[PDB]
Amino acid sequence: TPQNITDLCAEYHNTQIHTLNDKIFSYTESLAGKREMAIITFKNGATFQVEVPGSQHIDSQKKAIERMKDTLRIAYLTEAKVEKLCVWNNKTPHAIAAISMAN
Amino acid sequence: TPQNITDLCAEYHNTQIHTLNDKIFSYTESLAGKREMAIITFKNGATFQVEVPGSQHIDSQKKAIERMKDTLRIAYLTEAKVEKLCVWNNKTPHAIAAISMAN
Amino acid sequence: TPQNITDLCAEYHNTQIHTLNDKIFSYTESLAGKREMAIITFKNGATFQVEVPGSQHIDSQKKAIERMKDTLRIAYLTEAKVEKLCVWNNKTPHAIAAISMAN
Amino acid sequence: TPQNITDLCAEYHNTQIHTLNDKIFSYTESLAGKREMAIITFKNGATFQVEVPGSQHIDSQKKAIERMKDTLRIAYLTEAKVEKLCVWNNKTPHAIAAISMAN
Amino acid sequence: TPQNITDLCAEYHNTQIHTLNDKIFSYTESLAGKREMAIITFKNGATFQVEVPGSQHIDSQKKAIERMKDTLRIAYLTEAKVEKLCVWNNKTPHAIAAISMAN
Numbered sequence: 103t104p105q106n107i108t109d110l111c112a113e114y115h116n117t118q119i120h121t122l123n124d125k126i127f128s129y130t131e132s133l134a135g136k137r138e139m140a141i142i143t144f145k146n147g148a149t150f151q152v153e154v155p156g157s158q159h160i161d162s163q164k165k166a167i168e169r170m171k172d173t174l175r176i177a178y179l180t181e182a183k184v185e186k187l188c189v190w191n192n193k194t195p196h197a198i199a200a201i202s203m204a205n
Numbered sequence: 206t207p208q209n210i211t212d213l214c215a216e217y218h219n220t221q222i223h224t225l226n227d228k229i230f231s232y233t234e235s236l237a238g239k240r241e242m243a244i245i246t247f248k249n250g251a252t253f254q255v256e257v258p259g260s261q262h263i264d265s266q267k268k269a270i271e272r273m274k275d276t277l278r279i280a281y282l283t284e285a286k287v288e289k290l291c292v293w294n295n296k297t298p299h300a301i302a303a304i305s306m307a308n
Numbered sequence: 309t310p311q312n313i314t315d316l317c318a319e320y321h322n323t324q325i326h327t328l329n330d331k332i333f334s335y336t337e338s339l340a341g342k343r344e345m346a347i348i349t350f351k352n353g354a355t356f357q358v359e360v361p362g363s364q365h366i367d368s369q370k371k372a373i374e375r376m377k378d379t380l381r382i383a384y385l386t387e388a389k390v391e392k393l394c395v396w397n398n399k400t401p402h403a404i405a406a407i408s409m410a411n
Numbered sequence: 412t413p414q415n416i417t418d419l420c421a422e423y424h425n426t427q428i429h430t431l432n433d434k435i436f437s438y439t440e441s442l443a444g445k446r447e448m449a450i451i452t453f454k455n456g457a458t459f460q461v462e463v464p465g466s467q468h469i470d471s472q473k474k475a476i477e478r479m480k481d482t483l484r485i486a487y488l489t490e491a492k493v494e495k496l497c498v499w500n501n502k503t504p505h506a507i508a509a510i511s512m513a514n
Numbered sequence: 515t516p517q518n519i520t521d522l523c524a525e526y527h528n529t530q531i532h533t534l535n536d537k538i539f540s541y542t543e544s545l546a547g548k549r550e551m552a553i554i555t556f557k558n559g560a561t562f563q564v565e566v567p568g569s570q571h572i573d574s575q576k577k578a579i580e581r582m583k584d585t586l587r588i589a590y591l592t593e594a595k596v597e598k599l600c601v602w603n604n605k606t607p608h609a610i611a612a613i614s615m616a617n
């Protein structure tokens with residue numbers, strides 16, 4: 103299996119790496135019906151979503167989606183540096199597929 | 206798909222953005238029957254709930270309701286600055302739909 | 309809908325408010341069969357349980373029971389000041405219905 | 412309903428209280444099949460498990476077993492002082508039934 | 515039942531102990547389809563996965579797999595020293611079976 107986010111991201115169609123090397127600037131979370139999601143931004147204005155669970159997910163990606171929103175919240179609150187995100191770039195905002203964190 | 210809490214709130218009827226730019230002053234949680242809910246307040250007396258799950262919520266919102274109460278608890282304990290709340294204003298106290306945090 | 313713990317407590321029979329204004333002194337939790345519960349005390353010796361889930365609880369409370377134990381453990385570990393508890397006072401020890409944290 | 416760990420421990424056969432008054436020295440966790448468990452140690456070498464779930468457990472204990480593992484991990488990572496453990500002494504290592512924390 | 519990670523690790527085929535005595539250098543998390551997993555690395559370049567749940571795993575392991583990803587995330591964010599890992603060495607990268615923390 104790939105051993106880093108760059109290699110993991112490159113296996114998938116319609117994906118790309120954003121290199122942030124920065125903490126999350128804002129964290130937004132919604133419980134509204136059909137927008138049960140999180141949205142993050144960085145200081146540079148880059149904005150990312152964790153997608154609303156739907157038909158494009160295999161429904162074990164379901165637990166993974168919830169984990170990812172947990173990780174973004176704790177990263178925000180701990181000012182953890184986000185190294186890279188692997189995103190689907192065919193969504194607006196870009197939708198997070200993977201995150202890497204390093205000091 | 207919205208990129209911020211203001212645009213997301215505008216997708217919903219009978220909602221309003223409140224801007225607090227302040228940490229939560231009090232956090233209340235209840236397990237009592239029919240009042241399984243959370244209430245937050247700010248120093249200025251603004252008071253909001255996460256509603257008891259009911260018929261105004263769809264299946265997809267149930268997990269998000271639990272998530273939002275987790276988020277408010279950790280935000281209170283971290284003294285995290287709350288930027289904005291998107292709220293349903295036909296409820297008293299007003300009911301949270303979404304939160305944004307930035308500092 | 310109540311906007312504070314005192315008003316919420318008054319919607320039930322056999323409840324009362326304790327005003328602690330103090331951090332949790334001790335936190336005890338048990339996985340022993342039929343005693344799957346938590347117990348907290350304060351420096352003045354006031355002692356409270358989260359009750360074992362049983363037939364006296366409705367389905368909607370089961371998540372909220374789990375949540376309350378999560379809340380008491382993180383409040384203990386962060387030395388958070390507990391303002392008030394709403395408790396059923398026909399249990400020994402008093403059983404927690406709601407909690408408020410402020411200051 | 413007991414009001415302290417010592418009184419809870421005395422409801423059960425084959426138990427005893429260990430009085431540690433110290434933080435957890437090591438935390439071990441396993442996902443290997445048939446050893447889905449946690450093990451903690453103290454500096455003096457006292458060693459305790461949270462049992463692998465099985466037919467020795469009633470249904471109401473399964474959430475509490477998961478909770479106890481959560482509690483031990485956060486206790487370890489916060490260096491929380493463990494006052495007492497109630498354990499079954501007919502297991503090797505001794506199996507945790509309850510924990511109390513105080514400072 | 516084993517009392518430490520080395521003895522646990524000797525219970526399985528195709529496993530070995532790695533002794534790190536270091537905090538995790540990076541934490542990677544993916545929800546990408548069929549690759550829902552975490553990857554950690556240490557400063558020496560040692561790289562480990564928590565494997566995607568699949569047919570090598572029995573039902574009793576599924577909660578433990580999710581727990582182990584929770585553990586690595588919080589270990590990462592607390593800069594907790596990892597003492598040893600027990601891994602399956604017939605995977606790439608080596609797959610985590612168990613973890614011990616001590617400092």
Ligand SMILES: CC(=O)N[C@@H]1[C@@H](O[C@@H]2O[C@@H](C)[C@@H](O)[C@@H](O)[C@@H]2O)[C@H](O[C@@H]2O[C@H](CO)[C@H](O)[C@H](O)[C@H]2O)[C@@H](CO)O[C@@H]1O
Nearest residue numbers: 223246249250251252253254292294296297298299300311
């Ligand atoms: C506890 C209390 O009475 N506080 C009030 C504020 O009202 C609460 O908070 C607002 C946001 C809402 O959730 C109310 O239902 C609560 O009782 C009150 O805020 C104003 O409330 C009105 C309600 O229609 C509008 O939301 C305004 O936009 C708010 O400014 C303030 C000011 O009147 O006074 C107390 O702090």
Ligand SMILES: CC(=O)N[C@@H]1[C@@H](O[C@@H]2O[C@@H](C)[C@@H](O)[C@@H](O)[C@@H]2O)[C@H](O[C@@H]2O[C@H](CO)[C@H](O)[C@H](O)[C@H]2O)[C@@H](CO)O[C@@H]1O
Nearest residue numbers: 326349351352353354355356357397399400401402403414
């Ligand atoms: C361990 C012990 O005996 N503690 C007592 C207090 O009682 C405990 O805490 C109260 C809140 C209740 O849960 C009891 O069942 C516990 O044993 C005791 O508190 C008073 O308790 C009575 C009820 O029995 C009323 O609730 C009063 O409002 C409480 O002040 C205090 C003071 O009497 O003494 C020991 O700390």
Ligand SMILES: CC(=O)N[C@@H]1[C@@H](O[C@@H]2O[C@@H](C)[C@@H](O)[C@@H](O)[C@@H]2O)[C@H](O[C@@H]2O[C@H](CO)[C@H](O)[C@H](O)[C@H]2O)[C@@H](CO)O[C@@H]1O
Nearest residue numbers: 105532555557558559560561562563603605606607608609
């Ligand atoms: C190539 C890389 O990114 N790192 C390597 C180490 O290998 C990685 O980590 C090990 C533990 C294993 O998961 C490999 O699959 C990874 O690529 C490599 O560690 C040694 O790896 C060998 C197996 O190839 C043995 O497991 C040794 O015990 C490990 O120390 C080291 C060489 O020491 O080089 C880079 O750090």
Ligand SMILES: CC(=O)N[C@@H]1[C@@H](O[C@@H]2O[C@@H](C)[C@@H](O)[C@@H](O)[C@@H]2O)[C@H](O[C@@H]2O[C@H](CO)[C@H](O)[C@H](O)[C@H]2O)[C@@H](CO)O[C@H]1O
Nearest residue numbers: 120143146147148149150151189191193194195196197208
């Ligand atoms: C809120 C906003 O419009 N911000 C702009 C950035 O765009 C956002 O973030 C990127 C990563 C995508 O999720 C966008 O959909 C989102 O609106 C914008 O970032 C650039 O977006 C490009 C696509 O339009 C592309 O992904 C590029 O890689 C990325 O750098 C930046 C720079 O143009 O400006 C912000 O204001």
Ligand SMILES: CC(=O)N[C@@H]1[C@@H](O[C@@H]2O[C@@H](C)[C@@H](O)[C@@H](O)[C@@H]2O)[C@H](O[C@@H]2O[C@H](CO)[C@H](O)[C@H](O)[C@H]2O)[C@@H](CO)O[C@H]1O
Nearest residue numbers: 427429455456457458459460498500502503504505506517
């Ligand atoms: C690794 C080791 O040998 N530790 C010693 C303790 O034993 C461990 O911890 C106890 C609580 C049990 O879980 C043991 O199975 C485990 O090895 C030892 O504890 C004493 O062990 C006695 C018999 O093994 C008996 O259980 C007794 O209750 C307990 O106090 C302590 C104290 O002598 O020393 C460690 O070195």
Ligand SMILES: [Ca+2]
Nearest residue numbers: 125180181308
């Ligand atoms: Ca800062």
Ligand SMILES: [Ca+2]
Nearest residue numbers: 228283284411
């Ligand atoms: Ca402060």
Ligand SMILES: [Ca+2]
Nearest residue numbers: 331386387514
């Ligand atoms: Ca202190």
Ligand SMILES: [Ca+2]
Nearest residue numbers: 434489490617
């Ligand atoms: Ca220390």
Ligand SMILES: [Ca+2]
Nearest residue numbers: 205537592593
């Ligand atoms: Ca550091």
